[PDB]
Amino acid sequence: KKPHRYRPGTVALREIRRYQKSTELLIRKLPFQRLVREIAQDFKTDLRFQSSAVMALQEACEAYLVGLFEDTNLCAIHAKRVTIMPKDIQLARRIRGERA
């Protein structure tokens, strides 16, 4: 295990084990705070978002993204694969009944 080159695929497992034992937010607040304001501009201007609404929005978005990534990973191993692909997210969302 020289510090110059590590075997690809081994550092990702340690990262997965380390990130699966923490509850901190992965998406950052300031980049996410501007996305919420930019979307609400098309509906109605002069809107003031509370400090607790963006937090719940980010939490729900992170949970939905984690669920979608888990579904895509479950769909990936089905075709004798190990990586995700854009053709799998579409099927994972269609089976759930979201895209209809």
Partner: protein
């Protein structure tokens, strides 16, 4: 003064390492290149729907400030009950 507004440097706000860390937290070993754009689009659509619901709730409440209570109400109306933030 503040003579600027928000732009489209917002879909790019969801950075690549953030999506990579989210996929690693979910349980993904290898992430493809064309996954970030689709994830950003799906997240934008979901945020658009939730923000539209919150705006409708705020307009019905005769107010101009979106609250965490209205956000939780909209999330529960969709089918995603969230705890902690609110009550």
């Amino acid at each position: 003064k503040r003579h600027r507004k928000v732009l489209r440097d917002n879909i790019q706000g969801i950075t690549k390492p953030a999506i990579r860390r989210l996929a690693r937290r979910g349980g993904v070993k290898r992430i493809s290149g064309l996954i970030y754009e689709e994830t950003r689009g799906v997240l934008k659509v979901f945020l658009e729907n939730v923000i539209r619901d919150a705006v409708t709730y705020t307009e019905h409440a005769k107010r101009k400030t979106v609250t965490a209570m209205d956000v939780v109400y909209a999330l529960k109306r969709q089918g995603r009950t969230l705890y902690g933030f609110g009550g």
